[PDB]
Amino acid sequence: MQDAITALINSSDVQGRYLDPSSLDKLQNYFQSGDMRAKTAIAVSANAKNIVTKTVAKSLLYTDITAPGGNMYTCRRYAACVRDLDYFLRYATYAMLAGDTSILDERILNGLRETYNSLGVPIGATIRSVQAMKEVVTSLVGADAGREMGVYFDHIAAGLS
Amino acid sequence: SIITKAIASADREARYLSPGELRTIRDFYNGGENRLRIATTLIENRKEIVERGSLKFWECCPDTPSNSGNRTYRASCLRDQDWYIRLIAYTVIVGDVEPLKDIGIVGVKEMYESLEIPLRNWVECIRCLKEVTLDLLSREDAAEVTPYFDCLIQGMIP
């Protein structure tokens, strides 16, 4: 994976030149935002289980997904979906700390749609769950940090689609 | 099931089913009708079982989300009780805990911890349901039914 600093370094390196002033300004913006990024990571790490519980409550409960014949039927499938949401939240936190979505593409989104199609996991339902998770995180950590985290949640949702 | 377990054991060793395994399978196929009768008895009486057991469970475990004034929580708890009674009946049909384990024992703790429902309350409810069920079964039929209740209780205990 590459983070924001490494992304700028790679952008400058393919041209064989040092970081131009605009790249330095982007780097300084990332350095200035690191404090709120760490604060958001702390909050999400402290409330991960609550976040996933609220996400499932407002996105998947009492629908046909949890009924027999749904994809969250039986406790094993329910726990598997909860584990997938835990993965999504943790790697969204990783990407928010890193300042870019490379980790999401490398560890999650590469072939996740194919795996879900093979297993019969509904893509629309999990996109809805990711958007509900974005709303839950925004409610927990505030507006600005919520938007920063929603950038990567939207990246996950787009990658699934 | 035991049929599936025997087939898997034979398959692992790249051998046909041995005479002892075939004798075991024949014995369970002979007992299938009795198990079907027991499961039919469980299914036909599931509503009274759930009613009595839920009343007992709310008596003994009042501080539980279903007993909190929320209609949705109470309805979901009653639905879950009926669900588990029916699952125990189906696993009695099969003759081994494998279907009940595959549907509602593997990952039950994780599912109900994500739902924020105490698993000790579930153990109390399953105990009450087991008592009510044993009230309406013979000792011979209870010998077939009770171990599945115990398997569920063990799988629910933290």
Partner: peptide, 26 residues
């Protein structure tokens, strides 16, 4: 169809008097 926020609407008067209390409390 990348937006599903319209379907995540989530899922009153109490149905029990004096909830979460034991019988015959001293």
């Amino acid at each position: 169809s990348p937006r599903h926020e319209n379907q995540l609407r989530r899922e009153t008067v109490p149905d029990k008097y004096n909830p979460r209390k034991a019988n015959w409390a001293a």
